[PDB]
């Protein structure tokens, strides 16, 4: 074993490698949304800015899980990063609704990982997930729900001034 | 009697204890409106800010009446603070119309208290109500009437951009 | 259900609404103690200052629980705020001993709420209670015990200089 | 066609989408090298810093090609990002020699893309590749050759002080 | 019982007194290592500085456990501090390997204490150990493993320039 | 012998190792007094501050004797640090009287060590004890005698305001 390794089960080492690939895939989906809003037939620059910011945040989450795996004396194994489900994201409203669905699937995976660390009696790993990951997911899910509510009430997508004025006043 | 007590009738001491409970109840109604606009299915953050500010102002009015009762040598007696009439406030327009009705009922109670101090020949108590309470109620009632007029003219609640743009330009 | 709701049981939503009413009641008891020390027949101004500070801290605790209920997608329901047990608090020593009893009853309710979140497997709710509530209650209970010990040793209430010199040197 | 499109052949649009996937793959290989030097059985922190810097530079190259494709009125199509050839990189010398081989394969692909733009008479695309890509590759290839020369002369890998003192004096 | 005591079992009070003696013993072992590197026949001043810093950190850990025992209303009982296993520590490499073994034995004792607080349902005591002790031990164990790896690769102890150049470049 | 050793007798080397253990024991007794005044049933915070300061001063005296032993080319040998005589120190007056007795026993040991260095003709060792130790002990003994005199005249321990007002005005 590694000279530093203590109280660190092989099931937890394997589950951390699965979470690293999921954060890298989330970063790639947000990059694809950012490219779509910069097309000349779409042209919404504060929507493009917003999704490029989310893409860089998800890469930082991934690089912080790699640091934890080396600190406990586990070994990192990388896999393929699969392509997104779509190339064309249809509208400002539909992109926000797709992002809300993604963030809820990442939160479900983190809750399953906390349950495994609890069953293996790893208190350091439980505290790391609570402190750096769970409170950030709850904050992101609430912001995306508030954006979907306002866009639906203004009459997006059919009311043509709706996505233009939301790009200026909320995302500006 | 208290060693400080002079020209202070027992009817006025009892009427001051009734006004203290009414300001505490007004503060609780504005807190309930502030919580409603922060729901994920409502999401109007400048409406939530506005009503939380009114809730803190009404508590200051209450604490200033307690100071007056101790200065004249009367004795404070507290009662229950009853719950608001509603949990769901329906829209931005309906909440402003409920607040206009509340502020007019607080003003009516203050006018009845000035009439009692006039009949008992208490000039210090008449001047305190004129200086700190009557000119603040007239200013608050006029502001709420101007907000109701603008929201009705923009087409709230059915015109979906109306409450969104009023939250940005008047309450911002 | 709310579009944001995930891993949030209806028993926990109901227990959070009970804790909100208990913090609002604690805030009202400290306001009643602050009024008592400002009477002309009592006249202890640093005792009055101390309890008005505790009353404002307990309102902030309440408003922070309302924010958590809206973030997880639950619904806030308000009740009556009942009046305190007393209008006259007898002395500086007796008021500190009543406050020590109140803070221990609020801590017991928070420990029962952490036990319920543990049984329902809600790690986000467990961490919120640990981080913002449990370490503040332990710190408040120790300060109140140290004030009761010093006042009893100086000979309060019968030694008339005791509460006067404690108001100047500890609460000043 | 797009309303902005002028002098932009479909073969060049397809070749730009192939270069975008190659820069994203280069960024992933440098991230895998950075993780290796942070293991407790390797522990070379200025080697880890150096490769994390190269990984972030290659992502910026990719995001700048996406901007060019939208400016000329072409359409971006993403593919899978394949995993690196290795998980264990053996030594400081072997990692520098693998990086020199990678940078020469990226330069060969850029030279083939300039030849295609020359044959299609696209002067704007020729100038973009010359100005932002060709002079950066020649500078990177020369730096990596100088690092390999010094490490071989000091006696790496078998002379144990060689990689330690190069980490302190050249990469510090 | 103490007037402040709530939810605090006598087994946990006894286990906290055992951890206080273990941190005081760790502080004494690091002081003995610091004296050894200041001998005229050893003369390594950055090694002496490094171990004197660790000795002062372990005393702060002890004094913070005493504060917790008084806050929960338990009673402190002191024992003898036993002498270290050695007076002569042989080399820079052997001292780092002895320190790595000590830090892993302190971490094992803290994990046994978290398991006891979990079984007694003491959430305040669980959070204190997680927040102030577990993340500091994991960070210290990883640093000591990286120092042992570099010293072995440079050829310590037999390669006479190895401990001299590590004292200048890593501990400087 | 050590290459630096000159005019340094083996009896003096052995007497310096005995004085090192006595300063470490004095530091441990003052730490036990500091913990006692922070109990919730005692609660005297300027008494707790005062004794924690004395505990840190006695550790500095010990670390300065270790430096002298290495400078003259002698060898340090550590022993057990025995536990204090008491866990409960009864009052502010009784703790000051115990500290006065301790400081006089440390001074007696230093006078016996100066007499031995005089008999062995070691002028450097005589000057070190005069310059750094003898004038500090005479100053500490006089301060403790003045504190005992004032506490006895104010009526401590039975006059309950005595230790409270001395904590505020002399130790503040
Ligand atoms: Fe994430
Ligand atoms: Fe008012
Ligand atoms: Fe509270
Ligand atoms: Fe490149
Ligand atoms: Fe420690
Ligand atoms: Fe001393």
UniProtKB/Swiss-Prot annotation, chains A, B, C, D, E, F:
> Which SUPFAM superfamilies does this UniProt record tie to the protein?
Ferritin-like
Which reaction does this chain catalyze? 4 Fe(2+) + O2 + 4 H(+) = 4 Fe(3+) + 2 H2O
A GO molecular-function term, please? ferric iron binding
If you read the UniProt record, what top EC class would you report for this enzyme, in one word?
A: oxidoreductase
The UniProt function text for this chain reads: Stores iron in a soluble, non-toxic, readily available form. Important for iron homeostasis. Has ferroxidase activity. Iron is taken up in the ferrous form and deposited as ferric hydroxides after oxidation. Also plays a role in delivery of iron to cells. Mediates iron uptake in capsule cells of the developing kidney. Degraded to release iron upon autophagy activation by nutrient starvation.
Tell me how this protein assembles.
Answer: Oligomer of 24 subunits. There are two types of subunits: L (light) chain and H (heavy) chain. The major chain can be light or heavy, depending on the species and tissue type. The functional molecule forms a roughly spherical shell with a diameter of 12 nm and contains a central cavity into which the insoluble mineral iron core is deposited. Interacts with NCOA4; NCOA4 promotes targeting of the iron-binding ferritin complex to autolysosomes following starvation or iron depletion.
Task: Tell me what this protein is called.
Answer: Ferritin heavy chain
Source organism (scientific name) = Mus musculus
